[PDB]
Tab-separated table of C-alpha atoms and ligand atoms in Angstrom:
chain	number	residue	atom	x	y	z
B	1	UNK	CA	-5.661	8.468	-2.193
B	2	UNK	CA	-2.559	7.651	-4.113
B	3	UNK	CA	-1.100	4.617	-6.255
B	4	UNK	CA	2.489	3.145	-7.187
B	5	UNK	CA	3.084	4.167	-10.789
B	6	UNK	CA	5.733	1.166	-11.799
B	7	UNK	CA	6.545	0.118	-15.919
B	8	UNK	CA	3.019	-0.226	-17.298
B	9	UNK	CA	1.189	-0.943	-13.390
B	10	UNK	CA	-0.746	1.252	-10.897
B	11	UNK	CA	-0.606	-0.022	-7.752
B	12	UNK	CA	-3.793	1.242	-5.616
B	13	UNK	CA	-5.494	0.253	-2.432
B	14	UNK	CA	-8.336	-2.314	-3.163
B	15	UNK	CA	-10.989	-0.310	-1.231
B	16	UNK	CA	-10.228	2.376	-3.456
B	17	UNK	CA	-9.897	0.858	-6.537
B	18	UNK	CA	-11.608	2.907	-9.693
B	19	UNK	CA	-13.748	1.192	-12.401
B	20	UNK	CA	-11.701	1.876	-15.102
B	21	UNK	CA	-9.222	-0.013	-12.366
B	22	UNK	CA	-11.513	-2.951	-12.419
B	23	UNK	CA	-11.917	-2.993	-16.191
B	24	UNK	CA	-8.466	-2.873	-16.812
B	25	UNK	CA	-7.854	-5.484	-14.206
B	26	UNK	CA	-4.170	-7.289	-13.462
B	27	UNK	CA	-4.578	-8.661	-9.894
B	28	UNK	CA	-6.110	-8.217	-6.690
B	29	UNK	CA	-6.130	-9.648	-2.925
B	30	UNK	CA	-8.750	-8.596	-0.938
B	31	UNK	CA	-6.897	-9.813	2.293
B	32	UNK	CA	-3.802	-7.861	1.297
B	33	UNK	CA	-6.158	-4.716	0.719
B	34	UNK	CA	-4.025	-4.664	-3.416
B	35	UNK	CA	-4.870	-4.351	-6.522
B	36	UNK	CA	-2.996	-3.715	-9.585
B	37	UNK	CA	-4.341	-2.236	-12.999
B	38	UNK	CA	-2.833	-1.768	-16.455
B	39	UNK	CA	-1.665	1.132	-17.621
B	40	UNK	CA	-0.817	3.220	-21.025
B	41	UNK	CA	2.072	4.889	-20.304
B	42	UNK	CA	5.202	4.118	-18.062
B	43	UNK	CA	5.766	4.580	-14.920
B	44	UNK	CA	8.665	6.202	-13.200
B	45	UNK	CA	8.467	4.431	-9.329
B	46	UNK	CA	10.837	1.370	-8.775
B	47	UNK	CA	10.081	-1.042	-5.793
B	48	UNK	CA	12.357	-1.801	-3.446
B	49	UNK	CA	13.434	-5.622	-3.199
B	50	UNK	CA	15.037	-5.465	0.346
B	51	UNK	CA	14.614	-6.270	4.152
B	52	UNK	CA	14.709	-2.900	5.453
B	53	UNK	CA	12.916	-1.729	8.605
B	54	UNK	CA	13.028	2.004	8.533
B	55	UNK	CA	11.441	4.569	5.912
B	56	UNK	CA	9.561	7.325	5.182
B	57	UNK	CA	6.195	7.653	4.259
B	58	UNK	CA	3.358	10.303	2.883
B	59	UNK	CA	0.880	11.424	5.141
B	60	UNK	CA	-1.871	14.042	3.062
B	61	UNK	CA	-3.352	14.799	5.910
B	62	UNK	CA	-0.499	16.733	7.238
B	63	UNK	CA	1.497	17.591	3.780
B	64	UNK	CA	4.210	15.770	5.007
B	65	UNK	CA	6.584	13.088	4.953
B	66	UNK	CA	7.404	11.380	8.309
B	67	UNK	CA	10.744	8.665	8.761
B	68	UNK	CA	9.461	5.671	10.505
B	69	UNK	CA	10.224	2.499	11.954
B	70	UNK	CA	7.999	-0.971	10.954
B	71	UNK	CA	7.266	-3.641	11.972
B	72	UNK	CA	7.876	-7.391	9.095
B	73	UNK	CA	5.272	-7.915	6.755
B	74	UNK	CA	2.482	-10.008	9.258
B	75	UNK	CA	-1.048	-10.912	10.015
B	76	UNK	CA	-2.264	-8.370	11.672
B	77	UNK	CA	-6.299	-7.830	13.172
B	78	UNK	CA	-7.531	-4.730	11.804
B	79	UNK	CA	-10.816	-3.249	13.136
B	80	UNK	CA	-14.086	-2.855	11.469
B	81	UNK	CA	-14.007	-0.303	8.823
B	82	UNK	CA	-16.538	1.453	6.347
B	83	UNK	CA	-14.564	-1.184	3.312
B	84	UNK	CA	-14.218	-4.655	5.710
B	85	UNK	CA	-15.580	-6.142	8.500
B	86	UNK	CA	-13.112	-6.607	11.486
B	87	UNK	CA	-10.468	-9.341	10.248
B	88	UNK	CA	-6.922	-10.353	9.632
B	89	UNK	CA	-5.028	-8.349	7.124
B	90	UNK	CA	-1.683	-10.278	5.347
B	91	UNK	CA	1.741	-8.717	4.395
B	92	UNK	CA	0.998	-5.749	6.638
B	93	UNK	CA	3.707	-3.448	8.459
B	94	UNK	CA	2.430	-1.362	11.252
B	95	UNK	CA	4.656	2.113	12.744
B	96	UNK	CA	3.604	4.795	15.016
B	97	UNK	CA	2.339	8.066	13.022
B	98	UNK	CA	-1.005	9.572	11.766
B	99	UNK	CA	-2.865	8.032	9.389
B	100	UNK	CA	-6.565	9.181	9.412
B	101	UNK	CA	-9.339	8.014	6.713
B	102	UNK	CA	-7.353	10.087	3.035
B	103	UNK	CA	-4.124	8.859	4.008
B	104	UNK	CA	-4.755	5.006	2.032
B	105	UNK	CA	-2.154	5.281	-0.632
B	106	UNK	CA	0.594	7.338	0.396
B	107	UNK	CA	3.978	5.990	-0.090
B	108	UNK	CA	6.271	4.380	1.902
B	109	UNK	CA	9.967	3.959	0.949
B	110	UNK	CA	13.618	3.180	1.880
B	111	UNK	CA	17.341	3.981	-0.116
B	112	UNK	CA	15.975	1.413	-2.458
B	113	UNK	CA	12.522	2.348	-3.889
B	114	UNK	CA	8.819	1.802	-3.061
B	115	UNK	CA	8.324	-0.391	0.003
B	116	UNK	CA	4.782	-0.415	0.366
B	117	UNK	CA	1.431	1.905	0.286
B	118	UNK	CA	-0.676	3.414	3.703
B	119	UNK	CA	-3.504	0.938	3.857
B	120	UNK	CA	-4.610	1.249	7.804
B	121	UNK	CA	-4.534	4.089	10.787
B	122	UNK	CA	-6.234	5.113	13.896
B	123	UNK	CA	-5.026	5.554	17.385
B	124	UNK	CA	-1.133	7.193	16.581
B	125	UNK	CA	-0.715	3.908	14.344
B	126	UNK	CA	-0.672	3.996	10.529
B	127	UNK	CA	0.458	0.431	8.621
B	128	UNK	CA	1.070	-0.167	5.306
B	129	UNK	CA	0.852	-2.852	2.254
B	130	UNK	CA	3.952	-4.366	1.413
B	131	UNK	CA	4.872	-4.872	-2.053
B	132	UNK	CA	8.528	-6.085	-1.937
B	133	UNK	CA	7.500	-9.482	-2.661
B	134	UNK	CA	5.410	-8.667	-5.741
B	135	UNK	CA	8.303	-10.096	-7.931
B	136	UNK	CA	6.346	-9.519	-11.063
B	137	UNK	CA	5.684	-6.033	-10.824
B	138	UNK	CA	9.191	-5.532	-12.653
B	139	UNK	CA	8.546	-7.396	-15.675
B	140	UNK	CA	6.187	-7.675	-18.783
Q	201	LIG	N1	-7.032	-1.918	5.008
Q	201	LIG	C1	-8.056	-1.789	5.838
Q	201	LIG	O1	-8.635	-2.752	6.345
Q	201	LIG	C2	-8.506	-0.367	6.127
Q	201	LIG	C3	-9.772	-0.007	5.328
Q	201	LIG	C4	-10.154	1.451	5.561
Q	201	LIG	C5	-10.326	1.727	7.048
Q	201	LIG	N2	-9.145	1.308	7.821
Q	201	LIG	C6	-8.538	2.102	8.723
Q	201	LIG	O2	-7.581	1.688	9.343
Q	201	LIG	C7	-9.059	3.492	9.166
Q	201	LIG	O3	-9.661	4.168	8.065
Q	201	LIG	C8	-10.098	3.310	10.279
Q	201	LIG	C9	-10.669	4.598	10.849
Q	201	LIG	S1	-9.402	5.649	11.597
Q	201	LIG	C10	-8.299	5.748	10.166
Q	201	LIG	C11	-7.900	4.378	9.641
Q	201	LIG	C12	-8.737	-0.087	7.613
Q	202	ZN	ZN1	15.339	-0.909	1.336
């Protein structure tokens, strides 16, 4: 679990989306695995607006954060799950590390702010949602 708390958005993994999420509904993309909800107060994350390729992200399932390398924001085919079928995801990054089914919604980041969320795993592989394009997450 986890979300991106930025001004008055929470950023959260679709498949994990709440209903007070869904009532309270900004955007989603189910073939980005987003979606955004409104919030009452402020939040204090800031996303990065860069073209970086390293990191580090949160992994619950070991209590720690791990540096990593990724990959550009791509299609990617990711394997059946218990929230899609098999298909291809959009504006995914992939890096070696663990990322087991809890880890959706960790945070990845770089020296300037929020790059993305965990979103995929399995077999020593974890990828993530970007975000960095999400333009309007800094304003209204
Ligand atoms: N964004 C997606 O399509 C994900 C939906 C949840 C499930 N996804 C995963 O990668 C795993 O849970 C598969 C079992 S091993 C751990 C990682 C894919
Ligand atoms: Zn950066």
């Amino acid at each position: 679990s986890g979300a991106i708390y930025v001004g008055n958005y929470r950023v959260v993994n679709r498949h994990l989306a709440t209903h007070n999420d869904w009532a309270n509904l900004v955007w989603e993309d189910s073939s980005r695995d987003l979606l955004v909800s409104s919030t009452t107060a402020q939040g204090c994350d800031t996303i990065a607006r860069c073209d970086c390729q390293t990191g580090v992200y949160y992994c619950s399932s070991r209590r720690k954060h791990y540096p990593v390398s990724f990959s550009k924001p791509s299609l990617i085919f990711v394997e059946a799950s218990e929230y899609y079928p098999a298909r291809y995801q959009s504006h995914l990054m992939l890096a070696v590390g663990h990322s087991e089914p809890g880890d959706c919604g960790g945070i990845l980041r770089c020296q300037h702010g929020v790059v993305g969320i965990v979103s995929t795993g399995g077999n020593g592989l974890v990828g993530f949602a970007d975000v960095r394009d999400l333009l309007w997450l800094d304003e209204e």
